[model samples]
Target: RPPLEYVKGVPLIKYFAEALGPLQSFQARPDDLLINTYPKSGTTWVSQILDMIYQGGDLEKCNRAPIYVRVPFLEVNDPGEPSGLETLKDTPPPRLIKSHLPLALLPQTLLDQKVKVVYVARNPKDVAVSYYHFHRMEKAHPEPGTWDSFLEKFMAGEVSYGSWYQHVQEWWELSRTHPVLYLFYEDMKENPKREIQKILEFVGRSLPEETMDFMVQHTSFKEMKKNPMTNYTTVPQELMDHSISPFMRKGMAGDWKTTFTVAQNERFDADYAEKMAGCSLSFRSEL
Candidate 1:
């Protein structure tokens, strides 16, 4: 198993647990917008879209805060830094928050308030590949091993945030009964305009055609990767090995095809089929 510690019997990175306890009771308001996704599943991409929508597609206003500060991660905190929950308290109403926590780990008040949540899902193969590279770039994470070994850990729920299946499946199921907007990474990649419009309608934001077009241009992967405001360019080099890998790597679908070997693909498919059997959940492997 990959290095991990259990918090209330749930597997998580040891450092992350410090904030989880406080997060359980964190109060949520009805107007709060939550962006939930598993790691490396376009959290930043969607956050940028929402930020642009909230700022009325005004680049200057949207660029005022870094993406991390604009939509704080709910469960992770740096040493001596205020937890996301704490930050949320100071944030005004109609706040936008980000989280990688599974449904079971989310604050109970979020369910009680029925807060609007936008959950983004990506193919597990790409998620795993992205996460492996992410682990290499992030200094706080344990060193990722060989691709085969890392894949095994991801499939076994030994990595941080536990099983990708559980994370996506639980949120998938929750969407049926709650105010969750389920989005797929491939769908957004295929037609960002359509997806952006869907999000605007979901959040009750109506933008003019020109403004919508501006948002689409502003939040594209290429545009965001260069914008320090959303690209995390301000993060110190010691914390991110940009030479080895960037935080915003290729933002396309079917990346797994290049990384997974034939044998590995078959193994992953078998596992995915077995694990996802009898569930209506579906994901596109390519765009």
Candidate 2:
């Protein structure tokens, strides 16, 4: 794979700019619920959660299609595949549109329409570890070097969607002024029911206790990995080689400990302190 093309100071999949330029003029319907995250930061987990919520807790109805089909990624334009913007145009309203784009790149109509947004942020340490494995498997990303070097690049914001620090902090501030539900991956991992309660309240809709029980069971790491619809096995193997590392590898919060050296963890912590200073947003490094 080729290297990411840095656009507007953020690194993105090569040729991604082709879709991004047209996305600037996209029209946002008021009923849309935008899902935003930095890649590998619980994007699929939260997407599946919201999709199940949207389906009014019908498990079989959710099984009707893959999670990506139900909630399309807004900027993922794989080679020879339809761009997310084009795909979104064909889908009906009350859609749950997924994206990893930083706020600066999103269409202005999102603000004009005041669409409800559900944003997820994971700890940078775990995010870096997850994305390193992700880069190895997904053809869309340039091959990530070894973990040591990848951690360096990650700290420098050289990876796709750019700095984890900037992306999270910017969205955290936006929630103060806009219609946004800011969720943390660690929090979701610790107590999913509490987090789902926040989402239900944000949407102003509630499902029965039995339905919530179904959601909790179905969205578990083991459950999702086995489910074809949410596991991402439907995507072409040439595009995503699960043999290299499955998309749903480890859904736990502190997986970085297995890979990160003591020195690397210390360096990450120091840099994190500096990067996150003055920002009110806080992230749990592990459960």
Candidate 3:
């Protein structure tokens, strides 16, 4: 619900300034693994997959820490807690980090070091639906009113982390020149095993057939929802209104069909085509 502010031409929440300030000068190593996405873009799913692959599909090692702890968000921080940048400084080599920052806002060191980045994107329609619901549950976000108003703000880049179209397009371009692996949420849903194999190859790792099979089972949405480590069940209920909606609410691709009116869908399709024209980027709206 809070209005967004611009820093260096990039829009972000004001609360991110404290953390973003230090990140401008933060150092990144070549071996570091970064998970970047717009919010609700299957970030956690990929994070879990990469974490398990890094640990060679050992469930005990993977479960030893929660996903957030394993992959800390780079640009947001708790008031009394150590900043994510500070935490990563002390973290050992081959660290895994999560971020919602656009490509332009990322640290120059990360670009220079050529850290491995896995960028996941979801359909904008589904992203808007998921984000609207997320705003209602997340206390920090301003109240999202009716679907029409929220859609307008989202399409206009008035929401946090700015325009989804720009975010995806920037990364899509960056992947061509950098060590960025672009993944799609719908593709992951359609053929998770194939996507999982793609991630392993991207990260320069391989697993036995049985280990890969186990990881495929372990990272499934149904399994992740039950696992406290990945489900985010530990977040305080007061901060997250679970009674209204769970963090892992309905991980399907076309949930927007139920939420978007016929006119709204038509409007979005037109806007999407116009905004994304001339860009080679494409996303499946449904599985």
Candidate 4:
């Protein structure tokens, strides 16, 4: 639609505005570690880990900066444009930027460029469920289509950032060649400590047994749902008109099982089966 604008001070629009700027001006460093994922994916979770590693395990300082400014989205606005690229000029070195764009739309420099990347993939069933709440809360989406309609749109690549299948597949293919790690949201949910530890190891950070456990406890979905900063409770009241589903709607997996009918489930599986052969992908669902 129109150029992205802050809804109640949110930086969603700035992503695009900065991308439309001058090229060869952005200040992303060679050692930067980019966090890439589709909307409603585990971006915040990974961003927390990146903050912990890059800050020498200082969680407080990382939270102070807010994730939006910490990991700027590359193409949410306009990629390679002078104005867009220029926004990174003042961004600190070894930057950790986040983006929702697929591999094909990414800056060419990223592929051959010296950088670290992390891609988080989630079961599309939960993703669709989570994305529905996100759209309603953000007010970016007007139509609160039923789970069936949303699933159809999701499969057809009609939502923002395009098809979940295509997005994950391209990233998976690139992970084969790039210095990147692919993480599953289900795994993180299954065992946060183990998954977080593996992520820390991947990035060369060491955490003590107790400290690691504490981070896991403090950042769990239950904890985040109440923590205003992480919960996004600060969003203005007007933006949330429908008593819009809680942004923290059931973080548990297998939510789709309760919402999707047999026909819907079969359709989704058939589509996923057709695309699964092309990429290194995995998912978790209840029955």
Candidate 5:
């Protein structure tokens, strides 16, 4: 959280730089798995899958603690923020945590030691739509304005964390050298079970048929949308009122096709191609 006097629309550089400096030096053990993704890029979905894999596909452990608590966000400066590195320091092994930081900003230990990193990528168009709704619900923006206004901010890198294009490009470039798994949210949506297994394999975990079946079925968007804990409906009263859009707004892909205008789509495609830079990375958009 920013200081009390902090105003919206102000660049959060000083605040983010100061508070997140410690995260850059955070160490990663051999067993630790870090999940990194741009906002609105299937972060919650990946977090849930990681939670299941780490807990041996045990639904019980998942029910006891939500994924956010089990694998805390590395960059948020919450008053109740758990000592993520400190607590995991002595904890058994293979500590899992979530982050939205670009690769350039992650701790050095992560790459030097070859720690496994899983990054979820989503289509920028859908991401824009989802992010617009998120800003509305989270009150990330003053008021829910037209998509044109939102797209301008997104393209201009004026939004929080700046350009999604740069963030994904930096991380993808880092992934070329390190042990990183690039998962597409659209692929996960199409065939969740196979994708979940892919994640398990990346982390060196395997589950029996019955357990895998249950985990995949239960973690669906339908189930998550109904569970207050999973959907973030359990947010404290103060946050709930101020939030602009529900956190779990339309998880499926292609919402942007309906929401974004022709000019906006063209602009996003041009920028996306420029950032991709022939990197072989491609996004899935439903229509």
Candidate 6:
């Protein structure tokens, strides 16, 4: 696994060097919609939602390929064939591109073109818990030392993609004047249909009730867990071993209760308030 190196004060996996170098020269079409998030922040779930929305909620159309292939990870160079940058070139619009970079590290093309964007955020507690397990299993990440250490690192904004507080807040502020739809993981977990309806409106998608029902069922965590197209089991074992921990682990919100200790929670809450003291954005730890 490549160690994370800080770029523009954001921690990113080093192999992403492939994408980072060429990212500056890339072009983004106005019709494209970028899905941006901090890592472990319901990115895959949102990707599937947007893809299903783009397909007009057709279950069969959404099954054409894995979600990753359908929506290329704009800043990653996968271990196999085409780099994400190359894949995006071949991907016809309206393309759905994914990115997990903070504002400072983001490609300028996305802003220059002002393509529509969907930014998703999860509660810091849940995000930290999810990311700790993620690093344990994902071979692409540096070894996550221990939960206590990881939590401390997370609080300090030392983990990959950097501070959760700033990530969500900045994007929320960006949405005030930009074409960004800020969504919360907890809200989606609580009421998917309502959130789906919101997405449909933002993305200019309106589907028949029949199609909407299919999307509601199809993107549910239980359904996505087994669906070949969205489960991520197609990824190589060495890269993401489900035995150690599935790429799609717990999809529920508020799993932090199972991991965060009472004392840790107190400390986190204090620090969280300090960092996010001035933001209008708020989050739910549980759904």
lDDT of 3 by residue, 1-287 (tens): 45667876776766785578778788888889989999999999999999899888989998987787887778866555567887777776789999998877888888888888899999999999999988888765667788799999998888888889999999999897898889999999998899999999998888999998898898898999999999887777655776777889998999899999999999888998899999998888897
Cα lDDT, all candidates: 0.87, 0.88, 0.86, 0.69, 0.73, 0.87
Off by over 4 Å in 1: 1-3
lDDT of 6 by residue, 1-287 (tens): 77788887888788775578888878889999999998988989999989988887778888998888899988877677577888888897899999988888888888889899999988889899889989898889888898999999999888777888888888998997789989989989899899989999998879888888788898899999999898889888877888888877889788899899999999999999899888888888886
Better of 4 and 6 by TM-score: 6
For TM-score, candidate 2 versus 5, the one ahead is 2
TM-score of every model? 0.96, 0.97, 0.96, 0.83, 0.86, 0.97
lDDT top scorer: 2
Report the Cα lDDT for candidate 6. 0.87
Deviating ranges (above 4 Å) for candidate 3? none
Model 5 is weakest, by summed lDDT over 10 consecutive residues, at: 1-10
Q: What is the alpha-carbon lDDT of model 3 when measured against the actual structure?
A: 0.86
> Alpha-carbon error at 103 in model 4, in Å?
1.2
Off by over 4 Å in 6: none
Model 1, 100-195: lDDT tens digits are 887677788888988999999999999999999998888767768898999999999888888999888999898889999999999999999999
Sort order, TM-score high to low: 2, 6, 1, 3, 5, 4
User: For model 6, what is the error of residue 78's alpha carbon versus the real structure, in angstroms, after optimal superposition?
Assistant: 2.7
What overall lDDT, based on C-alpha atoms, would model 4 receive against the true structure? 0.69
List model 4 lDDT by residue over 1-287, tens digit each: 22334322222344443443443234456777888998887887787767766776666776665455556656544323223244455577777787775665566666656578888989898898888777666654546467778778778776666678878887888776777788988898888887888778777778778877877876788877766556555546554443667766777877877877899889888988997866556777743
Q: What's the residue-level lDDT of 15 in candidate 6?
A: 72
- Model 3 TM-score is 0.96
Error of 4 at 96 (Å): 1.6
